[PDB]
Design a protein around this ligand. Structure first.
Ligand SMILES: Nc1ncnc2c1ncn2[C@@H]1O[C@H](COP(=O)(O)OP(=O)(O)O)[C@@H](O)[C@H]1O
Ligand SMILES: [Ca+2]
Ligand SMILES: [Ca+2]
Length: 364
């Protein structure tokens, strides 16, 4: 091979995924955190491990970069610590959130070429990459991560900004809600350490009920839905209706005091904002992505809820890839490996010729 490996970096609100184009999975995943004492800067797992003696910062808390000084440190960490490569020696494909401000796109571009001296780079919308990973160029993606969720209609490879909806309800909120209801049950999960334990309980024992009320009735009259969970100190606790009550908040945000529409309604509203001529393509190609869409039963629940909102004559299909937790990264690996994509990279030459604003033309 003549070309060096290209890098794929998925910038997540909670976890960053990094690896090499062509691979089937990211080589590294770490917390999008930077910490400094209350070694001068700590990034990733280490910052989390030593959080006790540090003040943590979340530079991309809700999907959008808010502090470029710390984001630069996360990227430095990604190259030198996680992937152990020199960025000046490899093209880099970066991901961005839907509705990312134009100025931010230019900033990312300038930093890659001027700070890291990348030989080439490109930036793609997360939702679009997930759709690519599913083998489609048209459809609507419901991306629910750690700090944010989005419904992104995509037609012929292009996201439709006017129809994109943002929901400030995701994995983080669900974890805290589970801590709250488990505490109401009689336990006590309130500390940061306990938040990590509940996050684990959430990822392992929660599920989306097909019918909330029926599930609540079953849990109230029997122990058939109860599951045991063992804490590190040996204590075994019981999780009952909390298993499905937690993710139910995605469909009924009021449980969290939020007036926002649930994910099914948000998906429907995005589709309705699109040209009537492509709505059927979206209904027939609703793809789920992100860690928060991993709950067992979520696909069937979405199918049921969307069917209730859409015309009776509409064909509804929910696609839930088993590997959807990393579909963004995988889509990037696929894209960066495409023969026709090689001409699309922004080269250092092109950057020197046109400057940061070239990103709008090259990465439309
Ligand atoms: N199996 C699972 N069930 C439910 N939630 C999960 C599961 N696996 C991961 N999560 C949650 O998904 C979120 C992270 O997903 P991710 O798409 O990586 O987000 P981001 O890109 O914003 O960091 C976290 O809140 C995590 O707890
Ligand atoms: Ca993400
Ligand atoms: Ca409501």
């Amino acid at each position: 091979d003549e070309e060096v490996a290209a890098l794929v970096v998925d910038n997540g609100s909670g976890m960053c995924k990094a690896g090499f184009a062509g691979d089937d999975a990211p080589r590294a995943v770490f917390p999008s955190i930077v910490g400094r004492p209350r070694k001068d800067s700590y990034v990733g797992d280490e910052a989390q491990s030593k959080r006790g003696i540090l003040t943590l910062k979340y530079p991309i808390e809700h999907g959008i970069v808010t502090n470029w000084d710390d984001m630069e440190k996360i990227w430095h960490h990604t190259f030198y610590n996680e992937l152990r490569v020199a960025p000046e020696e490899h093209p880099v494909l970066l991901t961005e959130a839907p509705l990312n401000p134009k100025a931010n796109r230019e900033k990312m571009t300038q930093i890659m070429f001027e700070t890291f001296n990348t030989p080439a780079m490109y930036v793609a919308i997360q939702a679009v990459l997930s759709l690519y990973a599913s083998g489609r160029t048209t459809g609507i993606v419901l991306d629910s991560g750690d700090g944010v969720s989005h419904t992104v209609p995509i037609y012929e490879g292009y996201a439709l900004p006017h129809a994109i909806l943002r929901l400030d309800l995701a994995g983080r909120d669900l974890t805290d809600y589970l801590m709250k209801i488990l505490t109401e049950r009689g336990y006590s999960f309130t500390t940061t350490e306990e938040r990590e334990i509940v996050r684990d309980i959430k990822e392992k024992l929660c599920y989306v009920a097909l019918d909330f009320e029926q599930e609540m009735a079953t849990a109230a009259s029997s122990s058939s839905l109860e599951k045991s969970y063992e804490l590190k100190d040996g204590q075994v606790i019981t999780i009952g209706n909390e298993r499905f009550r937690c993710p139910e908040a995605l469909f009924q945000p009021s449980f969290l005091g939020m007036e926002a529409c649930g994910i099914h309604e948000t998906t429907y509203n995005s589709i309705m904002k699109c040209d009537v001529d492509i709505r059927k393509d979206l209904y027939a190609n609703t793809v789920l992505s992100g860690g928060t869409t991993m709950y067992p039963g979520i696909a069937d629940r979405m199918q049921k809820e969307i069917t209730a909102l859409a015309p009776s004559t509409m064909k509804i299909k929910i696609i839930a890839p088993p590997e959807r937790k990393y579909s963004v990264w995988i889509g990037g690996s696929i894209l960066a490996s495409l023969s026709t994509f090689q001409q699309m990279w922004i080269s250092k030459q092109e950057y020197d010729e046109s400057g940061p604003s070239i990103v709008h033309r090259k990465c439309f």
